Amino acid sequence: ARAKAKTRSSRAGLQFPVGRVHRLLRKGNYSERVGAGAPVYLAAVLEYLTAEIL
DNA sequence: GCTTTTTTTTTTCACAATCCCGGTGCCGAGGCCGCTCAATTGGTCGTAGACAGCTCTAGCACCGCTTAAACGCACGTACGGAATC
Ligand SMILES: [Ca+2]
Numbered sequence A: 001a002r003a004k005a006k007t008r009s010s011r012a013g014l015q016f017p018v019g020r021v022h023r024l025l026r027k028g029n030y031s032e033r034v035g036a037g038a039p040v041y042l043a044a045v046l047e048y049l050t051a052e053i054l
Numbered sequence B: 001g002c003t004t005t006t007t008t009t010t011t012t013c014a015c016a017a018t019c020c021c022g023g024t025g026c027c028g029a030g031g032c033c034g035c036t037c038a039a040t041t042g043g044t045c046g047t048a049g050a051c052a053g054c055t056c057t058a059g060c061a062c063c064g065c066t067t068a069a070a071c072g073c074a075c076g077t078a079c080g081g082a083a084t085c
């Protein structure tokens, strides 16, 4: 148990910050609990809507 | 049909404005540096919700009368809408 480094954005194959998105969900008063996929799905959508506009 | 006009459309140009080009200069996009704080890891601990099994609500199908409501036509009158000053 000392095996560190990887980011969730990298796991999901994304550019947008999954971790940040997660925190933002958690800190936003949206729901008491937040699934582990919730931010991944969301971030990916924001990536796509961002990419489409650009 | 006449002639004799006034209008509309064509042709013609002048001219005004906007578009295109190469050149110059500034500053903010862009990328890097060096520090830090927030994302990550691995722990623990508890309950949310996924599940299975059961109750009984209420949503659907159907039937068969009774009108109120939709339909389809005749009829003419006011309306929408062109033209003109
Ligand atoms: Ca329950």
Ligand SMILES: [Ca+2]
Pocket: none
């Ligand atoms: Ca059930």
Ligand SMILES: [Cl-]
Pocket: A034, A035, A036, A037, A038
């Ligand atoms: Cl999830």
